[model samples]
Target: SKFIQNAAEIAKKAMDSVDPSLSEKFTIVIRFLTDNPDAASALRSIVGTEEYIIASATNFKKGRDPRTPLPPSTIPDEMVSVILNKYFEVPSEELEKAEEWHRLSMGAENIVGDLLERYIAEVIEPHGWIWCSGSMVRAVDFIYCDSENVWQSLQVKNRDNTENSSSAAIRHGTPIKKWFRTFSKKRGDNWDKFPSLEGKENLSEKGFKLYVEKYLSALRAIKAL
Candidate 1:
C-alpha cells in the first residue's frame, strides 16, 4: 500500500537522524519484516512518537550533513596562488588561511540555507501549514489554505537570486508563491516581503533568529554540532 510505503519512508528518514544504536535496531527489524501487516505494525510503533519528533526537529536544525565537506585535495599553496592569479592573486603567506576560509564558508552557507526552510516549516505548522518534507514534491516546500480558503503552494529560498530564470519561469500558470529570506546584495533581511498569511502575522526575522539560536544551543548540548 502507498500509505504503508510513505510511512516506512518517513520512518526511515527519521531513523537516520536519531541515535545510532536505536536507529540500527529499528533498521535491522525493518529489514527483516515480511509483509504489509508487519510493516504497518512496526511503523505504528515508530512514527509520531516523542523520540521521532525530537529526532526529526534536531535533524532539520543540523541540516543533512553536520560535518563540513573536505576539499578534493590539499593542493600546494604555490599551485593555488598561480591557478587563481587572475581573480584572487592570493599571496603565499595567506594561502593556508584563505583556503580554510573558503571551504568553511561553503559549509556554513549550505547549513544556513537549510535552516531557513526548516524554521519556516516549524513556525507555520501551528498555523496549519503542511511541510512537504519529501523531495518528491517539485518546486513547493509548503502548502496551505489562505484567508479566502483557497489552497496555495509555497517555494522558499534563502536568497533572492538563488532561483534561476528557468526555475522561476516554470511557476507561471501555477499557484506557487516564492519567498526569499534575503536580498543578495542588500544589507538587511527581506522579511517584509514575505506573503501575508492572514492570521499569522507574528512571523519575523527576529523570530527566525531566535529559533536558530536555540536550535544551535540544543545541538551543541548533545555535541551534535
Candidate 2:
C-alpha cells in the first residue's frame, strides 16, 4: 500500500507534464472520484491500484484508432463494371465515379459514428465513467463502478441496428452492456433506455446536435489557422 501510493504520485506528476488536454481531463476524473467515495473505492477494488487507474484514464483521450482511408474498391474492375452495368443497368463509364462516391459514403458513415463516440465520452466521462480508448477491449467502449459495487462495462453504438450478430455475440460471455443512440427501424429515441444516461438532462438529441455543430466549427477554425 505504501509503494502503491508512491507510484500513483509519480505517475500523476509524469502525466501532468506530458499532455495538456489529458492532464486537465485526468484532473477532472480524479475530482469526480474524490467527490464520490463509493465510486472511487469500487473502482480501486476492481482495478487494484491507483497507478493503473491513472494510466488507463490518461489513455482515454485517444479513443479509437484513426480511420484508415478507403482504398480502391477490392472488387475486380470488371466485376465492378459488370455489377454496375448489369445489375443497375448503368453504363461502364460511370464505374469510377460510383466507386469514389461509395468510398466517400463509407467514410462519412464511419466518421459520424466515431465523432459521436467522442461526444458521448466527453459528456459522460466526468460523471465517473472512463472511456476505453484505443480498442483496449473488444466490444466495450466505457466502464464504471456502479452502485452495487460492481464494475460495469458498456458498449455504445450509433444505431440499434448498426452492429451485426457477430459483434453483438462478443458480449454474450462477458459482462458488457450495450446501448445505442438511435432506433434505426423506427422513429424514436434510444438514449432513454441507457441505464447510465437515461434521466440525464444533458443527453438529448438537440444537445448532440449542438455538440456536433460546435465541434465542426472548432475544426474549421483550426484548419483555417
Overall lDDT per candidate, in order of appearance: 0.55, 0.57
Least accurate stretch of 10 residues (summed lDDT) in model 2?
A: 36-45
lDDT of 1 by residue, 141-225 (tens): 6666456645566778888886444232222123567888888787898788887663347678999999888887776676743
**What is the C-alpha RMSD, rounded to one decimal, of candidate 2?**
7.4
What does the lDDT read for residue 150 in candidate 2?
A: 56
Tens digits of lDDT, candidate 2, 1-225:
112434445445645665655654454334333333233322222332555455545454444333333444555356766788899987677877887787678766766777777777778877867665543234656666566755556677888775344342321123567778887778977766765542245676777788888876776566644
Off by over 4 Å in 1: 1-78, 81-93, 145-149, 164-174, 198-200
C-alpha lDDT of residue 81 in model 1: 55
For model 2, which pairs clash?
none
